[PDB]
Design a protein around this ligand. Structure first.
Ligand SMILES: O[C@H]1[C@H](O)[C@@H](O)CN2CC[C@H](O)[C@H]12
Ligand SMILES: [Ca+2]
Length: 687
């Protein structure tokens, strides 16, 4: 029986093979069971007994080791991260099949990572995974913060419930989406966040999801045992493997303090070190606005014309079509966004709908849907480039693929060259629609390869990537820091399609943000969409002050101010926080945190002694008693507090805020109240 303990002695991982030769593990935290005894193994696809990789093992060897080194991300929530764990590697031999695997465990002070490894050997070379069976046995009927297991979308509102209640709530939790394949009445996605009755917080996730199929979790509610459930390919199989090869890591992050789930860097720690040698010379954070919300709300169109029932690139002559009067991506309009961006210190402007083919972007399973290089007649690529460069602005490329992946791959070098030739160095991609090649899912091994292929090719071009609808992140950004964003969760766009749950931004940091930043596109000031488009009665579930908080509480090196310029001009005093807030950080201090209820975070701007605070809250609001001793003794600071009015409310009074400017020091105190769906933001600049 094998014992592994964390450096600080608070965590013990016990490993053994049971009487059937099944590898089993368990985990305790400060003498509380976190993981009850749980098995590990896989079942392989038949080319009989060679399909069994789940029992009949015996321990052939074990090796231990300790590691403790620090490293610096190119961008992140702090300057430096410490990677500190005790390790146990267990070689398991299967006499029936004359073959061996290795399970490697790394135990940190804030949780455990394990992976399977398959050494090259006479009897194990090429193999196909039928299913992975990594178990995670819970010690009680925890409260979980979850979205439905789904091979194709993550764009769901979270549900808060007991594990025993998941089955009953799944049907209503799955709302409509143009591409979705739920797999189980008790299937949920990772990262999955839980709170136990005995005072613990537990996050189940994976890290370094590379050359492998995305892991979801299937709950056995007879048992309270969660199990790995991977994403099948077009024929139903779950990964083509070739030794020597590894599974991604599986992680259990645990603490009695919720804030430490946020502080954990286990995910990034388990990724391969940076493989882009000159990354720091060219990867930079980006604050941006865009021609975007117009089409999202329905006020404007991505399409250039309404007269054609369908289009054929290279055949349709758009210069002969009649403009629909609605097309936001036109030169004069883009120049006004360029104007506003330069006036207020933004880095870039995104434009969507610039390229031929948008008339057919949606729902058609169209192969040759875009070419990523040919502009509409009213989009003057060269003039826009000239103007932007004149204002010190960069244009952000848009590559919606409409989920036609072979087509994107065929065009990708030419699309990236086009970007280089015209002064674009960051791209937002998308994958809306069911995947072509048809029969594949968004999160299968096939597509995971494609998203990383796109990022690796971009890096050779010194291009940064932000990919919507891709597989949700698992820390790969350490290895390839030019992956500066994904959506890969329910974003601000759904505030325009009926709204996100009020508590949504109190959960995402605990689940989605684990593994990588999100391009959440915060900053909507006019929260009633009907003012953009009278047919849309959607209302953003936030106050204005809480939108401000999100620049701090939704970590990302890529931050949009998503409203249209007109609306920012109606509230320029509130806008000042968006202009000031930094995007990269030397320090982060998690002040308060409780999933589903509130999160408060102070971050120190990289290479300054300026700090920025944000608070975001759920349906009950939250009262903060803030202490400022992360501030430097003896220094003075100018602090500007942007808070909810005492009458504020997301629904009935979302635009009510106060702005107060005063002096702070590490002796100061502040009582503040985040309203129902509200929050606050503070800039604290050394004098
Ligand atoms: O603007 C984006 C949005 O940010 C993506 O999440 C989904 N989209 C599909 C179409 C268009 O690309 C739109
Ligand atoms: Ca989306």
């Amino acid at each position: 029986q094998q014992k592994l303990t964390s450096p600080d002695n608070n965590l013990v991982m016990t490993f053994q093979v049971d009487s059937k030769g099944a590898p089993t593990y368990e985990l305790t935290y400060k003498n509380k069971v976190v993981i009850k005894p749980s098995t590990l193994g896989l079942e392989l696809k038949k080319e009989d007994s060679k399909t069994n990789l789940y029992d009949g093992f015996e321990v052939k060897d074990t090796q231990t080791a300790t590691f403790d080194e620090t490293w610096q991300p190119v961008w992140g929530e702090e300057k430096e991260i410490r990677n500190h764990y005790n390790e146990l590697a267990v070689t398991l031999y299967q006499p029936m099949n004359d073959r061996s695997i290795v399970i490697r465990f790394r135990l940190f002070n804030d949780g455990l990572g394990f992976r399977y490894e398959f050494p090259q050997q006479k009897s194990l070379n090429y193999f196909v995974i039928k299913e992975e069976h990594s178990q995670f046995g819970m010690n009680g009927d925890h409260i979980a913060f979850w979205i439905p297991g789904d091979y194709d979308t993550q764009e769901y509102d979270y549900t808060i419930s007991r594990l025993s209640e998941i089955r009953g709530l799944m049907k209503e939790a799955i709302t409509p989406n143009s591409s979705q394949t739920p797999f189980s009445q008790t299937g949920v996605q990772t990262a999955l966040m839980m709170k136990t009755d005995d005072g613990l917080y537990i996050n189940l996730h994976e890290a370094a999801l590379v050359d492998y199929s995305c892991m979801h979790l299937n709950l056995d509610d007879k048992n309270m045992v969660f199990e790995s459930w991977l994403t099948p390919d077009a024929k139903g199989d779950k990964g083509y493997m070739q030794t020597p090869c590894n599974t991604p890591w599986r992680t259990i992050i645990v603490s009695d303090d919720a804030r430490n789930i946020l502080a954990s860097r286990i995910t990034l720690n388990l990724n391969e070190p940076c493989k882009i040698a000159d990354a720091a010379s060219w990867v930079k954070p980006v604050k941006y606005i865009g021609v975007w919300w117009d089409m999202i709300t329905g006020k404007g169109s991505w399409a250039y014309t309404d007269e054609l029932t369908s289009v054929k690139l290279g055949e349709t002559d758009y210069s002969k079509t009649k403009p629909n009067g609605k097309h936001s991506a036109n030169t004069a309009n883009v120049k006004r966004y360029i104007d506003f961006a330069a006036a207020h210190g933004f880095d870039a402007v995104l434009v969507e709908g610039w390229n031929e083919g948008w008339e057919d972007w949606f729902g058609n399973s169209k192969d040759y849907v875009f070419d990523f290089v040919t502009p509409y007649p009213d989009f003057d690529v060269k003039e826009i480039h000239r103007y932007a460069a004149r204002k010190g602005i960069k244009m952000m490329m848009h590559h919606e693929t409409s989920a036609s992946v072979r087509n994107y791959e065929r065009h990708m070098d030419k699309a990236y060259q086009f970007m280089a030739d015209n002064g674009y160095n960051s791209v937002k991609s998308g994958y809306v629609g069911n995947i072509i090649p048809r029969g594949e899912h968004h999160y299968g091994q096939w597509m995971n390869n494609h998203y990383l292929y796109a990022v690796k090719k971009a890096a050779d071009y010194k291009i940064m990537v932000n990919a919507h609808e891709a597989t949700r992140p698992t820390g790969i950004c350490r290895t390839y820091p030019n992956l500066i964003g994904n959506e890969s969760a329910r974003g601000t766009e759904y505030e325009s399609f009926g709204g996100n749950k009020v508590y949504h931004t109190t959960i995402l940091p605990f689940t989605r943000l684990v593994g990588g930043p999100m391009d959440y596109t915060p900053g909507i000031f006019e929260t009633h969409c009907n003012k953009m488009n009278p047919a849309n009665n959607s209302q953003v579930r936030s106050t204005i002050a809480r939108q401000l908080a999100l620049y701090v509480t939704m970590y990302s090196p890529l931050q949009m101010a998503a409203d249209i310029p007109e609306n920012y001009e109606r509230f320029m005093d509130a806008f000042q926080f968006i202009k000031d807030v930094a995007l990269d950080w030397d320090e982060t201090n998690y002040l308060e945190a409780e999933p589903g209820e509130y999160i408060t975070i102070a971050r120190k701007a990289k290479d300054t002694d300026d700090w920025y605070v944000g608070c975001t809250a759920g349906e009950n609001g939250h009262t903060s008693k803030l202490v400022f001793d992360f501030l430097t003794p003896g220094k003075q600071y100018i602090a500007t507090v942007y808070a909810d009015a005492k009458d504020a409310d997301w629904k009935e009074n979302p635009q009510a805020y106060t702005i107060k400017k005063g002096i702070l020091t590490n002796k100061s105190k502040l009582n503040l109240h985040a309203a129902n769906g509200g929050g606050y933001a503070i800039s604290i600049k050394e004098v």
